[PDB]
C-alpha cells in the first residue's frame, strides 16, 4: 500500500529546463496508472508499446519519470524518430521506446508579463543526442574554424538560449510541462507493479 | 565549414533572439497605441530604440558573410535583407543632415497652416479645414484659395529642402551600388537567381508603362464623362476639350476623384446600398461584426482567429480617459500573437473594414511559419491587395443578402450597378494616372533627366498630358507642389498604389473563377468556396520566401502584372461610358489653361 510518488513529479512547483532534464527514479511502490490517463487534465497522453488502457496490470523493474518544459510547438519532438532542436540537442527518445509521453499547458505558471526567461534550451551542438543522454555543457560553440577561447564573438555562440515565455504568446509559443515515463524490465525483482 | 553553413548558423541564432526583441517593441508600441500616456510614449521609444540598435548591430555582422559564396537561395534572401547599409553608407555628417531635412519636411507638412486673407487670426490646417473645402465645397474662387495657398506657403518652404533631399538620397543609393534613389526604390520588385522567375529593377518602368497604356481608353472616357459633368456645375470655368482644373477634383492634390460622386452620379434618385440602418435595427455590436468576418474566411477554408486575437485586440473604443489611436490596424506581434486595433462603430464602412483588416491577419498567420526575415507580403503591394479583395466580396449584394443584412426583396437593376461602378472608378481608376505620373516625375528627378530649373515646369507638363489635369494658376520654380502631398515630402515610394491596384483584381478574378462565378466580376462572392481559399492560401504561406512572380503565379497563373482583370471588372462601365460620350470629346488638349 506504499503509493508511488507521482505527486512530486507532476505537481512540482518548478520544472527543469529541457537541456538539463530531470530524472526521478520510482521503485518499490504501487502506481495507479489509470488515475492519470483518466483524469482529463493533460493535452497530450500518447503511450508507445504499452497500452494506457488499464495495463497497470503489468510489473516493471524500474519506472523513470523525466520532466522538463518546452514550448507547445515542440511537444511533437518528444516521440520516437522525430527530429528538431529538442530531439537532436536536448532530449532524445530512442526508436524502440516503450513508455508514455505526457504534457499540459503551463501558461498559468511558467509565463510572466514581460517574460519568464528561466527556462532554456540547447540551440547548438556538435552532434545529435544519443537516446536518454543529458548534456549540460556551457562550452562556447565554434561555428567557424578559429578557436573561441571561451568567449562568444564572431561565429562563436553561447550554446544555451532562453525560452522567452509570455502569457500573450500563441499556443505554440506557450510553455508546456512534459513528463516522460520509462518502463524498464530487467532480470530483477520487479518492485513496481501497481495493480 | 562553408561560409554558407556559418551564415545558416549565424542566421539561426539571429532569428530566435530577434523574435523576443521584436515582441517587446510590438507589445510596448501596442500599449501606447491603446493607452496613450507620456509613460508609454517613453516605453514605446525605449523598446524601439533597443530594437533599432539590435538590427544595426546585426546588419554589421551579417556583411561579414559575403553573398557571393552563399548558394542556398533562401539563405541568401535573409542574409541580403539584413545586409542593407541604408543611410549608414553615408558620412555621419551627411546621414545626420539627411535625417534633419527629412524631419524638417515632415514637420512643415504636418504643421503647415494657412490663414485667412484680411484676417490673420483665422487659420486652417490641411485637416480638417482645407481638406473639407477641396473635398466638399463648390466654389471655384474659394477652392482656388485652398489649393493655391497650400502650395504657396507649405510647398515653397519644402522646395530648397527637397533639392538637398534629392542630392543626399542619390548619394546614398549610388554608394549602395544603385543607379539613383529611384532605382533603389525599384529594388523591391527585383528577383535574381531563379530561372524563369527573375525580374529586373528597370522592368517595372516598362511593365508599369505597358500596362498603363491599356488603361488609357477606360480613363479617357471616365475623364470625358467627369469633365462633361463638371462643366454643368461650373459652366463659365471649364473647357469642353481641355484638361480638368486641378482644384476641382475633390482632393487638395487631386489624387482620388471619389468626392466628385455627388456631381457625377449616373442615376441620382436611386440610392446606394447602405446596410448601416439594417445593422442597428438588429442590434449588432463590434463583436458581431468581427464574428461575421471570421465566419467569412472560415467559409473558404481558412482558420478562425486565435483566442489571443479575441482576448487582446481592441475592437471597441475604450473612450473616456483612455485615449487611443483609432486608425484601423492589424498587428502581427509574433510568437503567435495576432491583434486588430479598431474603434469599431456599427456602420457598413466599418463592417467592410473589419474584413479588410482581418485579411491582413490571415496573411500574417499564413506565413508565420516562415523565418522571421521572410514574414511579409511577396512585395510592397501584395499585403494591401489581399486586404482589399475581402471587402470586394463582403460588399456585394449577393453576400449581404446571405448574412441577413440586405432584404431578400432587393434585386440588382442595371442602374444601381452603374452608380456603384462609377464610385469605384472615381477611386480606383481615378488614382492610377495620378499615381503613375507622380512616381514617374520622381523617378526622373532622381535619374537626373529633369533639371532643377524645370521641376515644376515638367511636373505640370506631365499632369496635363498624362493625368489630364491643368493648374488653375501659373507656377514658378519657387513651388514644389509634388511635395504638397504627404508621401513625397515624407519619403515614401508611391508606385505601390499602382501595383497593388492591378494585383487585387488579378487576385479577385482568379479566385472567382475557382468559385465558378457566372456573370460580371463586379458581383462575385468567394464565400462558401474552399477551392478559391486554397488557391489564395498557396500564395499566402509563401511570404517573401518565393519571388513575387512565383507568388502571383500561385494564385492567378501568370508571372507578371496585367490590367485586363481591372478592365474586365469595369467593362460594363466602360461600354456605358462609351454610350454617354458619343457626342462628347474623349481626350484632352495640353495647351488650354484657365490662367491665360
Ligand atoms: C536551404 O536551407 C534550408 C535550411 O532550413 C532547407 O530547408 C530545410 O530542409 C530540411 C531537409 O531535411 C528540412 O528537414 C527542414 O524542415 C527545412 N527547413 C526549413 C526552414 O524549411 C532548404 O531545403 C535549403 N534549400 C536549398 C535549395 O539548399
Ligand atoms: C496535483 O494536485 C491536484 C489537486 O487536488 C488536490 O491535491 C492535494 C495534494 C493538494 O494539492 C490540494 O491543494 C489539491 O486541491 C490533484 O487532484 C492531482 O491528483 C495532483 N496530481 C497527482 C499526480 O495526483
Ligand atoms: C495605461 O498606462 C498607465 C500608465 O502606465 C497605466 O497606469 C494604466 O494602467 C494603463 N491602462 C491600462 C491599459 O491598463
Ligand atoms: C554596403 O553594402 C555592400 C553590400 O552588402 C557591402 O559589401 C559594403 O561593405 C557595405 N558598406 C557599408 C560600410 O555598410
Ligand atoms: C475555432 O475552431 C476550433 C476547431 O477548429 C475550435 O476549437 C474553436 O473553438 C473555434 N473558435 C470559434 C470562436 O469558433
Ligand atoms: C454557406 O452554406 C451554408 C450551409 O448550407 C448556408 O447556410 C450559408 O448561407 C452559405 N453561405 C452563404 C454566403 O449564403
Ligand atoms: Zn489594409
mmCIF file of C-alpha atoms in Angstrom, chain B residues 376-576:
data_model
loop_
_atom_site.group_PDB
_atom_site.id
_atom_site.type_symbol
_atom_site.label_atom_id
_atom_site.label_comp_id
_atom_site.label_asym_id
_atom_site.label_seq_id
_atom_site.Cartn_x
_atom_site.Cartn_y
_atom_site.Cartn_z
ATOM 1 C CA UNK B 376 5.916 39.829 -45.239
ATOM 2 C CA UNK B 377 3.859 40.098 -48.407
ATOM 3 C CA UNK B 378 5.587 38.958 -51.601
ATOM 4 C CA UNK B 379 6.393 42.585 -52.459
ATOM 5 C CA UNK B 380 5.277 46.006 -51.234
ATOM 6 C CA UNK B 381 1.881 45.673 -52.925
ATOM 7 C CA UNK B 382 0.842 42.114 -52.089
ATOM 8 C CA UNK B 383 -0.303 42.629 -48.494
ATOM 9 C CA UNK B 384 -2.663 45.523 -49.239
ATOM 10 C CA UNK B 385 -4.060 43.625 -52.241
ATOM 11 C CA UNK B 386 -5.087 40.651 -50.078
ATOM 12 C CA UNK B 387 -6.851 43.008 -47.683
ATOM 13 C CA UNK B 388 -8.827 44.675 -50.475
ATOM 14 C CA UNK B 389 -10.331 41.605 -52.169
ATOM 15 C CA UNK B 390 -12.104 40.800 -48.892
ATOM 16 C CA UNK B 391 -14.278 43.927 -48.928
ATOM 17 C CA UNK B 392 -14.909 43.310 -52.626
ATOM 18 C CA UNK B 393 -16.716 40.069 -51.790
ATOM 19 C CA UNK B 394 -18.162 41.257 -48.480
ATOM 20 C CA UNK B 395 -19.911 44.284 -50.012
ATOM 21 C CA UNK B 396 -21.658 42.660 -52.986
ATOM 22 C CA UNK B 397 -25.467 42.399 -52.796
ATOM 23 C CA UNK B 398 -25.204 38.610 -53.097
ATOM 24 C CA UNK B 399 -23.163 38.447 -49.886
ATOM 25 C CA UNK B 400 -25.136 40.980 -47.822
ATOM 26 C CA UNK B 401 -28.341 39.050 -48.542
ATOM 27 C CA UNK B 402 -26.805 35.779 -47.340
ATOM 28 C CA UNK B 403 -25.992 37.131 -43.858
ATOM 29 C CA UNK B 404 -29.388 38.753 -43.312
ATOM 30 C CA UNK B 405 -28.486 42.435 -43.684
ATOM 31 C CA UNK B 406 -29.898 43.118 -47.169
ATOM 32 C CA UNK B 407 -33.573 42.393 -47.749
ATOM 33 C CA UNK B 408 -34.336 39.367 -49.975
ATOM 34 C CA UNK B 409 -36.595 41.770 -51.918
ATOM 35 C CA UNK B 410 -33.682 43.847 -53.258
ATOM 36 C CA UNK B 411 -32.607 42.910 -56.785
ATOM 37 C CA UNK B 412 -29.790 44.371 -58.863
ATOM 38 C CA UNK B 413 -31.042 46.523 -61.721
ATOM 39 C CA UNK B 414 -28.618 47.819 -64.326
ATOM 40 C CA UNK B 415 -28.893 51.369 -62.925
ATOM 41 C CA UNK B 416 -27.624 50.801 -59.376
ATOM 42 C CA UNK B 417 -24.956 48.611 -60.990
ATOM 43 C CA UNK B 418 -23.553 51.650 -62.808
ATOM 44 C CA UNK B 419 -23.734 54.023 -59.823
ATOM 45 C CA UNK B 420 -21.525 51.716 -57.777
ATOM 46 C CA UNK B 421 -19.016 51.064 -60.544
ATOM 47 C CA UNK B 422 -18.581 54.814 -61.017
ATOM 48 C CA UNK B 423 -17.817 55.401 -57.330
ATOM 49 C CA UNK B 424 -15.316 52.585 -57.684
ATOM 50 C CA UNK B 425 -13.959 54.056 -60.911
ATOM 51 C CA UNK B 426 -13.577 57.509 -59.357
ATOM 52 C CA UNK B 427 -11.427 55.981 -56.594
ATOM 53 C CA UNK B 428 -9.671 53.019 -58.214
ATOM 54 C CA UNK B 429 -9.298 54.175 -61.823
ATOM 55 C CA UNK B 430 -9.008 57.868 -60.973
ATOM 56 C CA UNK B 431 -5.891 57.415 -58.842
ATOM 57 C CA UNK B 432 -3.926 55.280 -61.327
ATOM 58 C CA UNK B 433 -2.814 58.098 -63.700
ATOM 59 C CA UNK B 434 -2.113 60.429 -60.769
ATOM 60 C CA UNK B 435 -0.074 57.637 -59.183
ATOM 61 C CA UNK B 436 1.861 56.620 -62.301
ATOM 62 C CA UNK B 437 2.602 60.253 -63.154
ATOM 63 C CA UNK B 438 3.682 61.257 -59.634
ATOM 64 C CA UNK B 439 6.146 58.368 -59.414
ATOM 65 C CA UNK B 440 7.388 58.972 -62.962
ATOM 66 C CA UNK B 441 8.166 62.597 -62.106
ATOM 67 C CA UNK B 442 10.189 61.420 -59.102
ATOM 68 C CA UNK B 443 11.884 58.538 -60.938
ATOM 69 C CA UNK B 444 13.111 61.083 -63.485
ATOM 70 C CA UNK B 445 14.065 63.760 -60.930
ATOM 71 C CA UNK B 446 16.262 61.209 -59.169
ATOM 72 C CA UNK B 447 17.511 59.907 -62.529
ATOM 73 C CA UNK B 448 18.732 63.409 -63.427
ATOM 74 C CA UNK B 449 16.508 63.686 -66.504
ATOM 75 C CA UNK B 450 14.785 66.839 -65.192
ATOM 76 C CA UNK B 451 16.989 69.793 -64.156
ATOM 77 C CA UNK B 452 16.291 71.823 -61.031
ATOM 78 C CA UNK B 453 15.140 74.878 -63.004
ATOM 79 C CA UNK B 454 12.364 72.813 -64.639
ATOM 80 C CA UNK B 455 10.999 70.705 -61.749
ATOM 81 C CA UNK B 456 7.634 72.470 -61.683
ATOM 82 C CA UNK B 457 7.585 73.096 -65.438
ATOM 83 C CA UNK B 458 7.972 69.368 -66.084
ATOM 84 C CA UNK B 459 5.536 68.489 -63.282
ATOM 85 C CA UNK B 460 2.603 70.353 -64.831
ATOM 86 C CA UNK B 461 3.513 69.299 -68.372
ATOM 87 C CA UNK B 462 3.010 65.697 -67.249
ATOM 88 C CA UNK B 463 -0.142 66.499 -65.260
ATOM 89 C CA UNK B 464 -1.652 67.947 -68.452
ATOM 90 C CA UNK B 465 -0.560 65.117 -70.755
ATOM 91 C CA UNK B 466 -0.784 62.041 -68.525
ATOM 92 C CA UNK B 467 -3.481 62.885 -65.980
ATOM 93 C CA UNK B 468 -5.488 65.426 -67.987
ATOM 94 C CA UNK B 469 -5.169 67.968 -65.166
ATOM 95 C CA UNK B 470 -4.240 71.645 -65.525
ATOM 96 C CA UNK B 471 -3.187 74.029 -62.776
ATOM 97 C CA UNK B 472 -5.571 76.974 -62.206
ATOM 98 C CA UNK B 473 -2.708 79.413 -61.535
ATOM 99 C CA UNK B 474 0.743 79.593 -63.188
ATOM 100 C CA UNK B 475 3.516 78.225 -61.021
ATOM 101 C CA UNK B 476 7.148 79.312 -60.832
ATOM 102 C CA UNK B 477 10.086 77.154 -59.755
ATOM 103 C CA UNK B 478 9.766 78.521 -56.217
ATOM 104 C CA UNK B 479 6.959 75.971 -55.868
ATOM 105 C CA UNK B 480 7.403 72.296 -55.009
ATOM 106 C CA UNK B 481 3.838 71.044 -55.395
ATOM 107 C CA UNK B 482 4.698 67.284 -55.674
ATOM 108 C CA UNK B 483 5.914 67.793 -52.091
ATOM 109 C CA UNK B 484 2.483 69.250 -51.062
ATOM 110 C CA UNK B 485 1.488 65.594 -50.783
ATOM 111 C CA UNK B 486 2.419 63.585 -47.670
ATOM 112 C CA UNK B 487 4.050 60.657 -49.496
ATOM 113 C CA UNK B 488 6.549 62.806 -51.442
ATOM 114 C CA UNK B 489 7.705 65.075 -48.607
ATOM 115 C CA UNK B 490 7.674 62.147 -46.140
ATOM 116 C CA UNK B 491 9.899 59.991 -48.381
ATOM 117 C CA UNK B 492 7.555 57.130 -49.288
ATOM 118 C CA UNK B 493 7.627 55.184 -52.539
ATOM 119 C CA UNK B 494 4.332 55.790 -54.333
ATOM 120 C CA UNK B 495 4.264 53.171 -57.111
ATOM 121 C CA UNK B 496 2.845 50.597 -54.670
ATOM 122 C CA UNK B 497 -0.631 52.115 -55.022
ATOM 123 C CA UNK B 498 -0.440 51.434 -58.758
ATOM 124 C CA UNK B 499 0.975 47.909 -58.477
ATOM 125 C CA UNK B 500 -1.316 46.874 -55.615
ATOM 126 C CA UNK B 501 -4.371 48.010 -57.589
ATOM 127 C CA UNK B 502 -3.550 45.798 -60.577
ATOM 128 C CA UNK B 503 -2.750 42.988 -58.125
ATOM 129 C CA UNK B 504 -6.103 42.914 -56.335
ATOM 130 C CA UNK B 505 -8.183 42.416 -59.486
ATOM 131 C CA UNK B 506 -5.839 39.729 -60.799
ATOM 132 C CA UNK B 507 -6.350 38.071 -57.408
ATOM 133 C CA UNK B 508 -10.116 38.640 -57.424
ATOM 134 C CA UNK B 509 -10.590 37.290 -60.951
ATOM 135 C CA UNK B 510 -8.525 34.146 -60.344
ATOM 136 C CA UNK B 511 -10.351 33.332 -57.099
ATOM 137 C CA UNK B 512 -13.829 33.989 -58.522
ATOM 138 C CA UNK B 513 -13.002 31.672 -61.425
ATOM 139 C CA UNK B 514 -12.429 28.912 -58.861
ATOM 140 C CA UNK B 515 -15.787 29.805 -57.301
ATOM 141 C CA UNK B 516 -17.166 29.341 -60.854
ATOM 142 C CA UNK B 517 -18.926 32.693 -60.677
ATOM 143 C CA UNK B 518 -21.300 33.208 -63.598
ATOM 144 C CA UNK B 519 -21.560 36.835 -64.654
ATOM 145 C CA UNK B 520 -19.620 40.073 -64.323
ATOM 146 C CA UNK B 521 -16.727 40.111 -61.879
ATOM 147 C CA UNK B 522 -18.492 43.085 -60.232
ATOM 148 C CA UNK B 523 -20.860 40.875 -58.210
ATOM 149 C CA UNK B 524 -18.648 37.927 -57.228
ATOM 150 C CA UNK B 525 -18.576 36.407 -53.743
ATOM 151 C CA UNK B 526 -15.853 33.882 -52.917
ATOM 152 C CA UNK B 527 -17.903 32.796 -49.902
ATOM 153 C CA UNK B 528 -18.550 29.059 -49.446
ATOM 154 C CA UNK B 529 -15.687 28.258 -51.876
ATOM 155 C CA UNK B 530 -12.777 26.283 -50.409
ATOM 156 C CA UNK B 531 -11.226 25.965 -53.880
ATOM 157 C CA UNK B 532 -10.745 29.734 -54.020
ATOM 158 C CA UNK B 533 -9.403 29.678 -50.467
ATOM 159 C CA UNK B 534 -6.791 27.027 -51.224
ATOM 160 C CA UNK B 535 -5.502 28.870 -54.302
ATOM 161 C CA UNK B 536 -5.138 32.119 -52.354
ATOM 162 C CA UNK B 537 -3.564 30.262 -49.429
ATOM 163 C CA UNK B 538 -0.960 28.642 -51.699
ATOM 164 C CA UNK B 539 0.446 32.169 -52.145
ATOM 165 C CA UNK B 540 -0.214 33.491 -48.631
ATOM 166 C CA UNK B 541 2.097 30.997 -46.922
ATOM 167 C CA UNK B 542 4.999 31.858 -49.237
ATOM 168 C CA UNK B 543 5.620 35.251 -47.645
ATOM 169 C CA UNK B 544 8.904 36.533 -49.045
ATOM 170 C CA UNK B 545 10.404 33.032 -49.327
ATOM 171 C CA UNK B 546 9.493 32.846 -53.024
ATOM 172 C CA UNK B 547 9.817 35.574 -55.685
ATOM 173 C CA UNK B 548 6.712 37.717 -56.036
ATOM 174 C CA UNK B 549 6.284 36.478 -59.614
ATOM 175 C CA UNK B 550 6.078 32.854 -58.463
ATOM 176 C CA UNK B 551 3.912 34.137 -55.607
ATOM 177 C CA UNK B 552 1.496 35.771 -58.057
ATOM 178 C CA UNK B 553 1.547 32.712 -60.335
ATOM 179 C CA UNK B 554 0.300 30.535 -57.466
ATOM 180 C CA UNK B 555 -2.975 32.486 -57.428
ATOM 181 C CA UNK B 556 -3.510 33.698 -60.970
ATOM 182 C CA UNK B 557 -1.284 31.542 -63.195
ATOM 183 C CA UNK B 558 0.599 34.465 -64.761
ATOM 184 C CA UNK B 559 4.112 35.542 -63.819
ATOM 185 C CA UNK B 560 3.521 39.282 -64.149
ATOM 186 C CA UNK B 561 1.220 42.270 -63.764
ATOM 187 C CA UNK B 562 -1.747 42.718 -66.089
ATOM 188 C CA UNK B 563 -4.501 45.313 -66.057
ATOM 189 C CA UNK B 564 -7.048 43.227 -68.045
ATOM 190 C CA UNK B 565 -8.699 41.972 -64.809
ATOM 191 C CA UNK B 566 -9.178 45.567 -63.693
ATOM 192 C CA UNK B 567 -10.657 46.322 -67.105
ATOM 193 C CA UNK B 568 -12.901 43.251 -67.006
ATOM 194 C CA UNK B 569 -14.056 44.448 -63.605
ATOM 195 C CA UNK B 570 -15.125 47.751 -65.180
ATOM 196 C CA UNK B 571 -16.114 46.611 -68.695
ATOM 197 C CA UNK B 572 -19.869 47.234 -68.133
ATOM 198 C CA UNK B 573 -18.971 50.767 -67.026
ATOM 199 C CA UNK B 574 -16.572 51.044 -69.969
ATOM 200 C CA UNK B 575 -19.340 50.390 -72.503
ATOM 201 C CA UNK B 576 -21.836 52.569 -70.622
#
